[PDB]
Amino acid sequence: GSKTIFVIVPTNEEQVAFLEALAKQDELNFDWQNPPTEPGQPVVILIPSDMVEWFLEMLKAKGIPFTVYVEE
């Protein structure tokens, strides 16, 4: 099992509100580890390889510091 783990780290109300806002999107069907409410906290999200490009361009658009991980 090689899944893509997306770890986002918000540093402002905009980043948090945005991360928590998208989290509501049930259409994503992602796997959230922790509730995106605390700013500066490393929010982990297990997403499929078929959604890595979307999240990548999504977070990159706003310029949010994230880190994509995968089963080494």
Next chain:
Amino acid sequence: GSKTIFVIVPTNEEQVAFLEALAKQDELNFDWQNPPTEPGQPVVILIPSDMVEWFLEMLKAKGIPFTVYVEE
């Protein structure tokens, strides 16, 4: 930088208790994303590359189903 993300998912009280127990170890200085109190849920633990062998062997000793991840 490249951090060592250790994903441990308990399958019973044994694994859960062991995880929630080791988490108390302040000597570890790890980074827990979520409190491993629910069985079947993979907990994300951000540990250093200098403790990867420790955790890996630790989980292997009991035979807990985990998954190590690193910055691709």
